[PDB]
Structure formats: structure tokens, C-alpha cells
């Protein structure tokens, strides 16, 4: 690991060089030399409100919301410095940090990343209240490129089926969850009964993880077999019946 | 409450207190506890379908 550290009460044009001299050293480590590499990036609201510092400074005209005009192109060029290239070997993943200014989804800033990156994760606060140590939410978020980033060739033929299939549980048991909040348990069937299960359980083991806990990805898919197996195998209609006939006995 | 209203529904409660016994009438009782238990069970559907 190369760590950088910039104090809040530090100069901003610090600020502003910062993020891009981790670039370039990720750069250079990544192409120059054959290695992979992912870089993280935390509060780049600070570096938004320091390019608002150094925009004052030149005395620009601001834009929308007090911004400067050209933070979409500023903001293309901390980006977009990483992926495959041909004849080498490296790579570079990118995952910055945001923070919503009391979930203005319209924001500037989170609106804009959102225009230039490839799908998005979020963070629910219902679920920090529920003391669940990852807050990390699942209906909303996506992953534009999982559809590649895995298959035969990567860890495991069935991921896509399970995924899509526990997708599809987990929305319909929100739902179900919503239906007994009004309709009552008396009148619940037994099917309605393990989406229930099936949502509680989710709930208290798997999206858990614990701040010293490690899982392998092979992990993972067996946990998601542990709770695809509560149903019958009838009831997955999302996923083909070769993988039920594999996996699920 | 099948659901969040309130319902009104019915039971065949049966008190047990004693028929009039007829047998005067050339003693027909054979053909009267026929009749009790064929209308019985009329009674009992009735207060279902009510």
C-alpha cells in the first residue's frame, strides 16, 4: 500500500494536487511496471469544495450552485485514468467515495460522477439504525459490467443465475414484507411465510460481515446456496434446472 | 378478520332442550324422527349460508 493523507485543516491547493499525484503513481506502478492496481478515493467532496476554493481565487463567474462551470471536465480527468490496454499486462481500478449533500440526488457532484462512471453502490442509513455493521443496501445499486466480470472461465459457472435469483427474492420478500405491515399474518400463506424466512435470515447472516471476517468469493456462493435452498427447487424459476440438478441436492 | 375489517358471522349453537315428542297421532314417530333429522340438517346449512 502507498497511503497519502490530507488534514482537513491543510493548505486546499494541496488539496487539489493530492488525488492527482496518487494517479500518477498509480500510473506509473500499473504501466511502466507489470502489476494491477486499485486506488481508492475518499472525500472528493473536499476536492470539489477546494477546486471552488482555487475558482474564486482566479475570480470566475460561478455556475450552477455556486460551482465552477468546468468541474465536468476536471472531473473527466481525475477519471477515466484507468482500464486494459493493448500489448501490456497491468490494470487499474477506480472506486472514490462520495458524500450527498442530505440526499440531494440532483447534486452537481454526485449526479455528474454518475454520469461518467459505470453504475453505483449505496449506503443506507435504515440499515446503520438496525446496527448492521456493512450499511450497504442492495436494491438500488448495480453493477454495469458484472455481466463479463464473471463466468465459466472465472470462479464459477452459476454466480449469474444466483445472483439474479436472490435479486429477485430479496425484492418480492421487501414486498411481502410490506403486505403483512397492512394485511396481517392470519391471512399469510405458507410460500409468503419462507419469503419471510428467507428475508430475516438474508438479513442476519449474510449481509453481515464483521469488521475481522474473510470470505472467498467460493464462500459467498456457498452461503447464497444455504439460503437459495430453503425453497423448493420448483419455486427458483429464475434459474435453469441443470444448475438446480448440480447444486442444490 | 379476514383482513382489516370487522365481519359478522354466524354459529349453529345447539341449547339441547327437549323436542316435543309426538306419538299420539298412530304413533308416526318413526316417520317424525325422520323429519327431525332431515330438517336438522337444512337448519344447520341454513345458518352456514346465513
Known amino acids: 500500500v502507498c497511503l497519502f493523507l490530507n488534514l482537513a485543516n491543510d493548505p486546499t491547493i494541496e488539496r487539489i494536487i493530492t488525488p492527482r499525484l ?21 472525500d472528493m467532496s473536499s476536492y470539489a469544495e477546494a477546486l471552488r476554493e482555487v475558482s474564486a481565487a482566479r475570480e470566475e463567474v460561478p455556475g450552477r450552485r455556486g460551482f465552477p462551470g468546468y468541474m465536468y471536465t476536471d472531473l473527466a480527468t481525475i477519471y477515466e485514468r484507468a482500464g486494459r490496454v493493448e500489448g501490456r499486462n497491468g490494470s487499474i481500478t477506480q472506486i472514490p467515495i462520495l458524500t450527498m449533500p442530505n440526499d440531494d440526488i440532483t447534486h452537481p457532484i454526485p449526479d455528474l460522477t454518475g454520469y461518467i462512471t459505470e453504475g453505483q453502490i449505496y449506503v443506507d442509513r435504515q440499515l446503520h439504525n438496525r446496527q448492521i455493521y456493512p450499511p ?25 443465475d444466483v445472483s439474479n435469483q436472490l ?36 438479513e442476519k447472516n449474510f449481509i453481515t460481515q464483521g469488521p475481522y471476517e474473510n470470505r472467498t468469493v467460493y464462500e459467498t456462493l ?15 424459476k429464475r434459474i435453469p434446472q441443470s444448475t438446480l440438478s448440480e447444486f442444490y441436492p | 378478520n379476514v383482513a382489516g375489517v370487522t365481519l359478522p358471522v354466524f354459529e349453529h349453537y345447539h341449547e339441547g ?28 346449512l341454513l345458518v352456514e349460508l346465513a
Open chain 1, 22 to 42: 496518487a494517479l500518477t503513481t498509480a500510473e506509473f506502478l500499473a504501466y511502466q511496471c507489470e502489476k494491477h492496481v486499485l486506488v481508492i478515493l475518499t
Open chain 2, 17 to 44: 332442550t327437549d323436542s316435543y315428542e309426538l306419538t299420539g297421532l298412530a304413533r308416526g314417530g318413526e316417520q317424525l324422527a325422520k323429519l327431525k333429522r332431515n330438517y336438522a340438517k337444512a337448519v344447520e
Open chain 1, 167 to 202: 435479486y429477485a427474492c430479496y425484492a418480492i420478500g421487501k414486498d411481502v414484507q410490506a403486505m403483512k405491515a397492512v394485511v396481517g399474518e392470519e391471512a399469510l400463506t405458507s410460500d409468503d411465510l419462507l419469503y419471510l424466512e428467507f428475508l430475516q435470515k438474508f
Open chain 1, 136 to 160: 450497504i443496501n442492495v436494491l438500488p445499486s448495480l453493477s454495469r459490467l458484472m455481466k463479463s466480470a464473471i463466468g465459466e472461465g472465472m470462479t464459477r459457472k452459476d454466480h449469474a
Open chain 1, 222 to 236: 456457498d452461503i447464497g446456496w444455504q439460503l437459495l435452498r430453503i425453497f423448493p427447487k420448483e419455486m427458483l
